[PDB]
Amino acid sequence: GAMTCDLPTTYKWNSTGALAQPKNGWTSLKDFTHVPYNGQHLVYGSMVSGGSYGSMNFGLFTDWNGMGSVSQNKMSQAAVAPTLFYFAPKKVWILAHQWGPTSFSYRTSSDPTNPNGWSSPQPLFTGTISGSSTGVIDQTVIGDDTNMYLFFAGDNGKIYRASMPIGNFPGSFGSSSTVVMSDSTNNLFEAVQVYKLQGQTKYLMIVEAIGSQGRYFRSFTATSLGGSWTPNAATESSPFAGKANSGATWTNDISHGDLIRVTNDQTMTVDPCNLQLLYQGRAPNSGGSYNNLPYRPGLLTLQR
Ligand SMILES: [Ca+2]
d(CA 214, CA 239): 12
Domain positions in the chain: 1-304
Query: How many other CB atoms sit within 10 Å of the CB of residue 90?
Result: 12
Can you list the pairs that 60-69 forms with residues at least 24 positions away whose Cβ atoms lie under 8 Å? 64/16, 64/19, 65/19, 67/19, 67/20, 67/41, 67/43, 68/19, 68/20, 68/21
Distance 156 CA to ligand 1 centre (A): 7
**Resolution of the model in angstroms:** 1.9
Ligand 1 centroid, distance to 164 Cα (angstroms): 31
Amino acid making up residue 295: Y
At 216 the three-state DSSP class reads strand
The Å distance, Cα 185 to ligand 1 centre, comes to 5
Output phi, psi for 184, to 5 deg: -55, 155
- What residues are paired with 279 via a beta bridge? 298
Q: In terms of Cα–Cα distance, which of 81, 104, 82 is closest to 95?
A: 82
- The whole-angstrom separation of Cα 217 and Cα 250 is 17
Asked if residues 235 and 241 have their Cβ atoms less than 8 Å apart, the reply is no
CA of 157 to the centre of ligand 1 (A): 7
- The dihedral sign for the CA sequence 26, 28, 31, 37: positive
210: helix, strand or coil: strand
Residue 264: strand, helix, or coil: coil
Ligand 1 centroid vs 293 CA: distance in angstroms? Answer: 24
Q: Tell me the CA–centroid distance for residue 219 and ligand 1, in Å.
A: 20
Residues 106, 128: contact at Cβ < 8 Å?
A: no
Residue 188 CA to ligand 1 centre (angstroms)? 10
